[PDB]
């Protein structure tokens, strides 16, 4: 299907957007985000509507849609 675009909001209000398919495992997003922030992936927690995003969660499992937000906090 189509990519949806998710906005990842940092603790400093910066944003990096990610295009993922509905079946993509979100570990891939977490790794890319941590790489771009220059920190270990395991130093961060990623939340969707306040709930923890697992490595093998997909947008379909979480009910995500175009322009949904992910918030990143320290682990």
């Amino acid at each position: 299907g189509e990519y949806i675009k998710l906005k990842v909001i940092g603790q400093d209000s910066s944003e990096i957007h990610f295009k993922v398919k509905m079946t993509t495992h979100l570990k891939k997003l977490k790794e890319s985000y941590a790489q771009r922030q220059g920190v270990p992936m395991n130093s961060l927690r990623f939340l969707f509507e306040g709930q923890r995003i697992a490595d093998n969660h997909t947008p379909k499992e979480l009910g995500m849609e175009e322009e949904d937000v992910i918030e990143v906090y320290q682990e």
Partner: peptide, 16 residues
């Protein structure tokens, strides 16, 4: 002002 950042999340030939 930050610019927009959009990231796309997308063996017989081996020799080692």
């Amino acid at each position: 002002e930050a610019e927009e950042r959009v990231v796309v999340i997308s063996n017989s030939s081996s020799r080692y």
